[PDB]
Design an enzyme around this catalytic site. Structure first.
Site, short mmCIF file in Angstrom:
data_model
loop_
_atom_site.label_atom_id
_atom_site.label_comp_id
_atom_site.label_asym_id
_atom_site.label_seq_id
_atom_site.Cartn_x
_atom_site.Cartn_y
_atom_site.Cartn_z
N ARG B 372 1.05 80.51 2.30
CA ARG B 372 1.69 81.31 3.26
C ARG B 372 2.32 80.38 4.22
NH1 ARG B 372 1.17 86.55 4.62
NH2 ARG B 372 -0.67 86.76 3.49
N1 LIG Z 1 10.43 87.82 -0.45
C1 LIG Z 1 9.90 86.54 -1.09
N2 LIG Z 1 10.49 85.98 -1.88
C2 LIG Z 1 9.95 85.00 -2.56
N3 LIG Z 1 8.63 84.56 -2.54
C3 LIG Z 1 7.75 85.39 -1.46
C4 LIG Z 1 8.45 86.34 -0.70
N4 LIG Z 1 7.42 86.74 0.10
C5 LIG Z 1 6.38 86.26 -0.15
N5 LIG Z 1 6.62 85.29 -1.13
C6 LIG Z 1 5.57 84.55 -1.18
O1 LIG Z 1 4.46 85.36 -1.70
C7 LIG Z 1 3.29 85.25 -0.96
C8 LIG Z 1 2.55 86.57 -0.79
O2 LIG Z 1 3.28 87.53 0.13
P1 LIG Z 1 2.37 88.59 0.99
O3 LIG Z 1 3.47 89.68 1.17
O4 LIG Z 1 1.81 87.87 2.13
O5 LIG Z 1 1.25 89.34 0.09
P2 LIG Z 1 0.06 90.16 0.31
O6 LIG Z 1 0.11 91.53 -0.56
O7 LIG Z 1 -1.40 89.42 -0.22
O8 LIG Z 1 -0.07 90.46 1.68
C9 LIG Z 1 3.85 84.81 0.44
O9 LIG Z 1 2.84 84.04 1.20
C10 LIG Z 1 5.06 83.80 0.12
O10 LIG Z 1 4.55 82.54 -0.31
#
Ligand SMILES: Nc1ncnc2c1ncn2[C@@H]1O[C@H](COP(=O)(O)OP(=O)(O)O)[C@@H](O)[C@H]1O
Ligand SMILES: Nc1ncnc2c1ncn2[C@@H]1O[C@H](COP(=O)(O)OP(=O)(O)OP(=O)(O)O)[C@@H](O)[C@H]1O
Ligand SMILES: [Mg+2]
Ligand SMILES: [Mg+2]
Lengths: 464, 506, 48, 463, 73
Positions: B372
């Site tokens: 993250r």
């Molecule tokens: N828009 C995006 N495009 C590409 N990779 C992403 C994007 N958003 C997140 N990622 C990656 O995917 C991971 C998971 O995103 P997240 O929304 O935090 O998941 P969760 O549903 O567990 O809260 C992020 O920490 C980032 O590294």
């Protein structure tokens, strides 16, 4: 007073009340006052009442009958005289060789070795079986699961192991038969009897027909046996090492599941005793090499449902120091030992561990064998002609390796009159690395059959 | 000689100087280190419980008329009716820098047998997470001594990141290397053994003291044979000791090993309390049970430090970095407990079985492994040099996947495949082979510059090592300067390509 | 003839990889089902 | 009058009360020793009832005294709660002084009447191709992000907040529910960088908190928004209300956590049986009425990534706007990873979306459907041994997938590539042009991780 | 030869117990130093009946509602 009377029993469960001033602790011995049935303290039901399981049948017994305590867990005799005798779970004679002369007995439920007692070093356990010696080398205080079907002289394998351990290092051997197919146990007894190996091993079988508790406890029984034997130390300290073969610990798991149901507590996720991991550790960590002396253990195991995701093998792998498998077709090819060499794996396969050069040679050999399996299919479908020349050389040399693996044995020696094969490390590797040079392509593959050292191979080539 | 006599005499003149008012409750029912005690009303939930056997207990159930509780250790010397008192005081554990170079009981008792150690501070084990208004963004790097790891998956100070894989596939060796890296850094590092083989334990130990790392280092162990209670409780204690230095504005590092055993052990224990289970025998709180522990690690504010030490500091932001371990059955990433834990971590790493089987040590499935935080901790050099390379190779993986049942390949696919092969071979290292920053720096420079798509496939790694030798011999001031800073300047890369041509000439 | 052999070999490979897939699927599904009825049984026994 | 503790299990408490004084089912019960508070749940009777605690369960013994407020949980309410950070009790955590207003409102309330619902018929353009294409929105609708653990449930929300926030002007509220503290604090500071920080209010009930705290956490913010919608502007009504849910699954999970201790039974999996009714109660107090408009966004974690779980199933019965994530799409590296198929919208109306929008979307889904179907055989057989039109459609669909891949304005954090905002017109024209096959001569790489069709042209001619 | 019958309509107990009886009669002639042979039929239904009894005996449920004693039996 030092005894109580029967107050209720259901299934295999027995309940007896005591006075508050006298009530035993767990695992202590409880003899039914009036018969030979024995009870194992399990948990204190309070109110002077405690729960136990009987060792043996459940009839002839009714409530109100007095039952006493020893205030001590099961103590079974330990000594050199134990060799050559087959005993019950309670270490009571069943070969009709009279009572065991040794009255020196020891308690069973005892604590695992200390951290300080952890042998500070690791080193390669040795034997005379080249495929074992190289492809799956062992370490003292080792734990290897055995795999395969039926009809390969598993017993014979163990016999050769015991002969070698008693010969090279006088290492003692004990066997525990868990869920023994009684006929097979008798046959195995006669087999180890004709061979004089009988005197060098201690025997107790837990027949699957018995009440599951004693079947459970025979493991710790033999464990304590081996503990005493290794701790039994000659002059200069440093008692000999001991070897233990355990009959299909999977059956032991099944019995644990049974008794888990018997207490009437929760059946686990797949359905098992939830405490299975703890008693695993009870077994394993009680077995290792010590600062002075070691005990190595080799354990039979069956995979239920042929799956490697059910809990039992998963927990098992937490302790299997190596993998040894037996292939049926290999025996069908008259190759003995019939061990599948390529797929049995040892955790102890590091140049840090096995030695650098040793590691390199082993890696190259397995690479060659892997290649040959990739090749033989194309051969059969397309003839040996259509290969590259080096491919043909690999074919011939690998088949030579397999032939070289074929060896007689001192157990086979008495079976069919022929000198057994004893070969250590660094004795095989010389011939093997020489073979990696292809210096024996002139030597026929047949010159490697039922032979020991490479010197013997060349002697055979001379006579052939 | 007599010095022990004087010491014992004065210790005897010390205490037990008077009677004491106290309350007892005797045993009622016993099963598997789980006991039912009646007669103690002043008790505390989860307090230390006194026993004539010298052991202690933690309280579980405050019912109307008795208590059920848990053993701390074996219990075979226990029986109903014995005496059982109450400390009136919550669970604690000694904590201090004195713990360094020591391995002890899960209750801080020296299993090394190197003398008991007093810790002038002792702290309760169960604690709550700090406040949100005190948290600090992760901004500081942590180096893993890797190329594959440090580059494609950044990990900064205070981040939590699970490591997941199979048996004998390289899961710990990685954390160990990371710890050894921290030698020079001087950061706080501490690891917990949880229900594993003492052989493995002593192996880890002997390796550590061989490195001499076990001097800025502390480890505590939960043996696989110890009754499940200690397995359950230990990681919380380890976190407690770790938090000491983070509570002092000092960056910290913890390594949790095999939380799966702790999870299943707790499942068993709680089920023995006959509580109904959820999916696959796990109760629901298990998610909370681990996660609450995991939240205790973070990067905090110097303001929080001042609120903690109320003048005892000048105020520096502290942190604690988390290294948890969970194994996967048959590579089931979708497994229930994995699904739970990934929802908790700030990121994850997974190791591919086949590549280690193919000898690639380590063997990263970079496809699903992300942080993250990402580029908030890498050096500007690393951060700018990286950024899509992990994605590029991830897409190279799926390209190769699609490139086996179709015979057509454009030049885009051709170049992607050929460069993916080179970069794949570029991400190899040896066990116990750390890296200075310039190492991977020049490696990735060569890769991006196509300086690898030109030389022999197999000779890639040989060229790499000989390049390191070439430079660190000739250019030792250069790499010294660059790795002492973590900043890049264009003239630096000019020197880099000059070395590139000179070594390619050799 | 050559290309038919190649294609059929590829078909064999696809079938084998799918076969591995199906053993894993069967194993997990069987485990889940078994655990499920176990849950039902333990819930039911708690009643009377 | 006061009560005394008689048993402690986990995080659920029971107390003895005088026969004269038995507090109602929902009241605040102050620990007479500490700041710890209690809510009643069950009338266990005979002068004894059951309750849970808010805060630590430690430092608590039996027989200790507890008072009643004779008042349920009623928390401070009003605009004086904006730009502030509150606890589950609605008390400051930002340490920016106590809140100013004195109005309180009970967290509990019945649902609004049938005679009060509103026709949310207002669309929205966002800038994300897949969303504005497949899921037209109703200003005032419920927006749920069905997704597993680590699929991008938080990210997809952060970017929307960026876009939504900047496109909006008025009220807004956030309530952290059982999540990582780090992400929440980071969001807070990011908002502080913005200025609608003032326009919004913060409250965090996080995973660290005890489950009793973890349960009645949403009630606060949802009641806040309900007020503000009912809080009418002079010579007017309430304003456009921005609502954002963070893993209501956490609330469900807490309900699971407590049920067994509540003397309750175990659902078909282990949930509380009452889960459906409590979820419905929760959802029904969330609606844009005749008075005011309330726009709600829902973070929907999916346990084990399974749809057939009871909770998501119930959830669909609640969400007009459904958005679902996949693990395999992320396994392909496509960020975002929203599945085209299952994520749907009842706003998808030809009389509403315009004919061309409707038909283009339908054709797109049709193409993807055939491609997914034929995936089996193409895995089995050679791609070449297929009909030519089949292969054409395959390449079409793959390029479609790529054309969905978009950089997001906050996503550049883990990539660096600048995020995009693509007007719907560009999206429509580009997808139609693809479906026209105007680009069958174009390498598929030219569509990966892009925005508009002109970007595709630039990438291709570049390549 | 001989045959002993446990008809489906019989109360489960006798069905549960018969195989052991037939075993005993066979052992007779085994104890008569001679040899013979026995056939065991529908052991599955036997286990079914025994499970039903155990259930009615308030005995703890087992996997597939089978207490482990069945294998012992
Ligand atoms: N828009 C995006 N495009 C590409 N990779 C992403 C994007 N958003 C997140 N990622 C990656 O995917 C991971 C998971 O995103 P997240 O929304 O935090 O998941 P969760 O549903 O567990 O809260 C992020 O920490 C980032 O590294
Ligand atoms: N870079 C490397 N190169 C070669 N081998 C390596 C490398 N890194 C680790 N290994 C090897 O991986 C082997 C297996 O890993 P290891 O036994 O140390 O722990 P593990 O993977 O966590 O397994 P376990 O389940 O037994 O704890 C080790 O014997 C180690 O030598
Ligand atoms: Mg390990
Ligand atoms: Mg999430």
């Amino acid at each position: 007073m030092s005894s109580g009377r029967i107050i209720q029993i259901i299934g295999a469960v027995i309940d007896v009340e005591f006075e508050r001033t006298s009530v035993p602790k767990i695992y202590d011995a409880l003899q039914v006052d009036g018969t030979e049935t024995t009870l194992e303290v399990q948990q204190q039901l309070g109110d002077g009442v405690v729960r136990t399981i009987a060792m043996g049948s459940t009839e002839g017994l009714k409530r109100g009958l007095t039952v006493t305590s020893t205030n001590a867990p099961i103590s079974v005799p330990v000594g050199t005289a134990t060799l050559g005798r087959i005993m019950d779970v309670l270490g009571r004679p069943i070969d009709e060789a009279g009572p065991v002369a040794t009255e020196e007995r020891l308690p069973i439920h005892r604590q695992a070795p200390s951290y300080a007692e952890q042998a500070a070093s690791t080193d390669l356990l040795e034997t005379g079986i080249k495929v074992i010696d190289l492809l799956c080398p062992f370490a003292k205080g080792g734990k290897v699961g055995l795999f395969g079907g039926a009809g390969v002289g598993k017993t014979v394998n163990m016999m050769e192991l015991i002969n070698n351990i008693a010969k090279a290092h006088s290492g003692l051997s004990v066997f525990a038969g868990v869920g023994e197919r009684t006929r097979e146990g008798n046959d195995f007894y006669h087999e180890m009897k004709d061979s004089n190996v009988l005197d060098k091993v201690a025997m107790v079988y837990g027949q699957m027909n018995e009440p599951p508790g004693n079947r459970l406890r025979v493991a710790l029984t033999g464990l304590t046996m081996a503990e005493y034997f290794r701790d039994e130390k000659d002059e200069n300290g440093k008692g000999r090492d001991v070897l233990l073969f355990v009959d299909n610990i999977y059956r032991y798991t099944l019995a644990g599941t049974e008794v888990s149901a018997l207490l009437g507590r929760m059946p686990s996720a797949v359905g098992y005793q939830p405490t299975l991991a703890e008693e695993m550790g009870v077994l394993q960590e009680r077995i290792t090499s010590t600062k002075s002396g070691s005990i190595t253990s080799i354990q039979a195991v069956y995979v239920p449902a042929d799956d490697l995701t059910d809990p039992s093998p998963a927990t098992t792998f937490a302790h299997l120091d190596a993998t040894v498998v037996l292939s049926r077709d290999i025996a069908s090819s008259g190759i003995y030992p019939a061990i599948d060499p390529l797929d049995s794996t040892s955790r102890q396969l590091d140049p840090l561990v096995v030695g650098q050069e040793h590691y390199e040679i082993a890696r190259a050999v397995q690479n060659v064998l892997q290649r040959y399996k990739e090749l033989k299919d194309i051969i059969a479908i397309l003839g040996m002609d259509e290969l590259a020349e080096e491919d043909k050389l690999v074919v011939y040399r690998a088949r030579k390796i397999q032939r070289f693996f074929s060896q007689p044995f001192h157990v086979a020696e008495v079976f069919t009159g022929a000198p057994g094969k004893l070969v250590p490390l660094k004795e095989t590797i010389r011939g093997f690395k020489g073979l990696l040079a292809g210096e024996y392509d002139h030597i026929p593959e047949q010159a490697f059959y039922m032979v020991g050292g490479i010197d013997e191979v060349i002697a055979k080539a001379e006579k052939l | 000689p007599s010095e022990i006599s004087a010491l014992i005499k004065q210790r005897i003149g010390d205490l037990d100087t008077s009677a004491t008012a106290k309350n007892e409750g005797t045993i009622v029912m016993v099963s598997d280190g789980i006991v039912r005690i009646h007669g103690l009303a002043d008790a505390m939930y989860g307090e230390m419980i006194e026993f004539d056997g010298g052991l202690f207990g933690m309280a579980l159930n405050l019912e109307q008329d008795s208590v059920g509780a848990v053993v701390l250790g074996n219990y075979l010397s226990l029986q109903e009716g014995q005496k059982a008192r109450c400390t009136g005081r919550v669970l604690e554990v000694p904590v201090g820098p004195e713990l360094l170079g020591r391995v002890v009981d899960a209750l801080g008792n020296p299993i090394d047998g190197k003398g008991p150690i007093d810790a002038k501070l002792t702290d309760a084990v169960e604690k709550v997470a700090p406040g949100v208004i005190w948290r600090q963004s992760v901004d500081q790097p942590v180096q893993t001594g890797y190329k594959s790891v440090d580059t494609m998956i950044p990990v900064g100070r205070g981040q939590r990141e699970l490591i997941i894989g199979d048996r004998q596939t390289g899961k710990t060796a990685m954390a160990i290397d990371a710890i050894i890296a921290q030698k020079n850094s001087g950061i706080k590092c501490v690891y917990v053994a949880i229900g594993q083989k003492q052989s493995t334990i002593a192996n880890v130990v002997r390796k550590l003291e061989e490195t001499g790392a076990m001097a800025y280092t502390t480890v505590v162990a939960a043996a696989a044979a110890d009754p499940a209670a200690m397995q359950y409780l230990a990681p919380y204690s380890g976190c407690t000791m770790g938090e000491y230095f983070r509570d002092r504005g000092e960056d910290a590092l913890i390594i949790y090993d095999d939380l799966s055993k702790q999870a299943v052990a707790y499942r068993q224990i709680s089920l023995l309390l006959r509580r109904p289970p959820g999916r696959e025998a796990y109760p629901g709180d298990v998610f909370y049970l681990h996660s609450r522990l995991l939240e205790r690690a973070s990067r905090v504010s110097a303001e929080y430090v001042e609120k903690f030490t109320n003048g005892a500091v000048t105020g520096k932001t502290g942190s604690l970095t988390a290294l948890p371990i969970i194994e996967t059955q048959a590579g089931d990433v979708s497994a229930f407990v994995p699904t739970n834990v990934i929802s908790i971590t700030d990121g994850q790493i997974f190791l591919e079985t086949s590549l280690f089987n193919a000898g690639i040590r380590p063997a990263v499935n970079a496809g699903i492994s992300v942080s993250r935080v990402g580029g908030s901790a890498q050096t500007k050099i690393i951060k700018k040099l990286s950024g899509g390379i992990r994605t590029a190779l991830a897409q190279y993986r799926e390209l190769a996947a699609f490139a086996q049942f179709a015979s057509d390949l454009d030049e885009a696919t051709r170049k992607q495949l050929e460069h993916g092969q080179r970069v794949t071979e570029l991400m190899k290292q040896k066990q116990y082979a750390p890296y200075s920053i310039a190492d991977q720096a020049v490696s990735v420079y060569a890769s991006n510059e196509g300086y690898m798509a030109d030389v022999e496939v197999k000779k890639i790694v040989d060229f790499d090592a000989a390049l390191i030798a070439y430079f660190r011999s000739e250019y030792a001031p250069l790499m010294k300067q660059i790795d002492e800073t973590g900043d890049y300047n264009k003239d630096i890369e000019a020197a880099i390509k000059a070395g590139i041509e000179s070594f390619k000439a050799t | 003839q050559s290309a038919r052999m190649v294609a059929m070999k590829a078909a064999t490979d696809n079938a084998g990889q799918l076969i591995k897939d199906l053993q894993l699927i069967y194993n997990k599904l069987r485990q889940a089902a078994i655990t499920q009825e176990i849950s039902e049984i333990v819930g039911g026994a708690a009643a009377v």
